[model samples]
Target chain A: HMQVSVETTQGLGRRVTITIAADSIETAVKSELVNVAKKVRIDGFRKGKVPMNIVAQRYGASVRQDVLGDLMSRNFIDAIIKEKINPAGAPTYVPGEYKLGEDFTYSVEFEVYPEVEL
Target chain B: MQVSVETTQGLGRRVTITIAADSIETAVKSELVNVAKKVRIDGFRKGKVPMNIVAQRYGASVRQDVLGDLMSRNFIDAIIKEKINPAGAPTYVPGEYKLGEDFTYSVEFEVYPEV
Candidate 1:
């Protein structure tokens, strides 16, 4: 799960801050490792039989990148939809140093849908 | 089909896309042929259903799908051709849509800044 906080920055502009828990990141990383284990081939071990620890050592960073990319995009869309926010444009994501076992946080600035009276 | 571009305050733009009825028909036909390959219709072998029947069964939704596709596709094409770098997916407005007539709709969205 993710937590989102909305702050009104200016006219039609809102700053949305999202936080992903470390536990969720670790779970996603483990799940991605299981998915990668089936296809990964190594010199000493038969395909699909590589140990989880070795897989973590070898392919952890790239797999984490993929998981983070997928999680962020999916949860961002879900959060905005649940919040009933129709954004005017793509958001600018704030950059941060993300590490394992630490919560990841980012913020986006975007314009909301204009209110119209017919 | 035709395109018109207008600028607005706060990095927003208004783009109008006019689509011809023939294009819509052509796309609907092509989409139906593709849909016929996988759709299971009673009393007809796979990929053997007639176009008219397929149209009768699935035309309305397929037309809506094609219209949505064409709108986005042509919107991108027009923007690329005119060198307008869009900031996001466009906000589409409803337009009068009648078969065998010109269809026009406007999109409002933001654009990137120039260096």
Candidate 2:
């Protein structure tokens, strides 16, 4: 189960599914955690001083998976944003679920920016 | 940094481009960040660790972002740089890449025909 929010221009009805790998999800979590570590406060350690292993242990596996899913979706959405390819609705991540180590793949199944009708 | 990539389908001359894959998992990782928050690590409070530490705790996330970033960045750049009027999906395998140094990818997308 996953959640995706894609914002595109009105012209672009929906974008096609852009398959994302599990590595991508993994990367986002670690990257953010790098920053997160500084702010997180653990029981035995001061804020930002806690070790990664402890952090992972504290936060259930589900949390990482959820974050990874969100990261994958956001990456796609950002591409849309940076490219200025506005879509009609938030790009939803269909087949919202993925397994780690296993190549996490999913199709977006959305309409691309339509041709000008005006 | 816009670069040139040979057409995947042997369409000829190189095309200007830019990539976001600094390492590998760049794109997917980036997307996840916006979608979710907090990566748990050892000794750190739940959902309150610094980003750098997280990277140390888990390196895969950055790797993924590197790759994803490369694809998204390159894709978007190719579209605009070539002013390609794509009629359909771009040519070439989007994820046909290796996770290592000196990685090369050929992208071929539909472009507005040369009038």
Candidate 3:
């Protein structure tokens, strides 16, 4: 499960914190790792005849970072759409350090579009 | 219930397809669960929109979108099942929308002249 909470900062500025469940994050990490394992040539294994734990232990950190980057970008839109917040300009995202098996959380803060009476 | 393929002119095929109500709803609900998981509204938490309200609210709209998609899938599947290799683009003439009933369409396509 993924969770989002927004609080008013200054004026139109808002801070939105998105929290994704540990299981959800693990799914992406494992998914990307599977693709990498299938395509890489590791020691003792030319293809992914190798086991998952060995690959997980080796490339897990960097692969998780890659997954974090993608997950951040993917969910930004999803979060905005669900909450129906119209983004004014490019928002800045501050991501929390992610650990395997722990929930991943990040904060995105920006000003929203202002509605004017016509 | 699926298709009736007929040989019209040379290299021309007329396929009449029927996609069941049950088949259409299956895909619609599958797509809803994916959507349901993401949006938290009212009582449902993020990634936890209950299945009951999911069908209650979005079933109509989701089914409409699914029907548009299943047409393409069933069309290709129908022709492929008949072992018909089509030549250029196929034209679909969908029948009237039937409430809680199956969907039907007729496609006019050109089969490959050879092979």
Candidate 4:
């Protein structure tokens, strides 16, 4: 679901870019659609009667936004842990954009914990 | 989230809760993705295995853990909101919990009598 890349811009500062694949987004969105289907109304269809395809067409991008927020938050924590980073400051993130059927990408820059000597 | 309280046989109470599925899904899926980020298997590079494969392997167990976690917190939130003082650990009953649908569950416990 994710691809991670890291680079150093300066001393103790790092930038990490993450891309979550579209396939994962589809699964998450599809599952969310099932929930939305139960509550949303559409003409010519009863509540939750909106076909899956139509639901995807109408709401996929928006829901993709939601899934992106959730997936990214989780992925970031794991990424930092796996990378063994000790962040010294708050993160600044640029979440590119949300689009269906394409890899979603974002980057975060932060200062790592500085080395300390006794 | 909806909470319902019932007074069972004397000094006993039951609290039922209904939670939105998407709210549950967000947590489950996030944890699953976190797992996916670190899982290792042959024929795939680290942090790059397909998400579905991860789900196929770990979805059920991870979701169970997430549900257990959320339910614990939600139960506490419910009882506190209802101002019910539990006298002991709760006995849990999980209702028909279909994915993408509202989840219903109940916790039965004894409460302290009024002063």
CAPRI rating of model 1: incorrect
Against the true structure, what is each candidate's TM-score?
A: 0.47, 0.37, 0.47, 0.49
Give candidates' CA RMSD values in order.
27.8, 24.6, 20.0, 19.3
Best by DockQ: 4
Residue A74 lDDT (model 3) = 86
Instruction: Report the TM-score for the A-chain of model 3.
Output: 0.86
How high a TM-score does candidate 2 get? Answer: 0.37
Model 1 ranges off by over 4 Å: B1-115
Clashing pairs in 1: none
Q: Tell me the tens digit of each residue's lDDT in model 3 across B66-110.
A: 888998898888866887767878888999865445788888989
lDDT of 2 by residue, A1-118 (tens): 2333344435445543454554455566676555656777634345787555334434435456666567566766666666566554545555645544334545454556566789
Candidate 3 structure quality by residue, lDDT tens digits, A47-106? 665445434545667787887888887888898888998878899999987644456889
lDDT score at residue A24, model 4, on the 0-100 scale: 71
Question: Per-model i-RMS in Å?
Answer: 26.6, 14.3, 19.2, 10.2
- Chain B TM-score in each of the candidates: 0.88, 0.50, 0.83, 0.87
Candidate 4 regions exceeding 4 Å error are A1-118, B46-48
Q: Using alpha carbons, what is the TM-score of model 3?
A: 0.47
Question: What tens digits encode model 1's per-residue C-alpha lDDT throughout B1-115?
Answer: 4889988788999989998766776787788778767666443343444443345456678878888998888888888898887788879985977543457888899988776
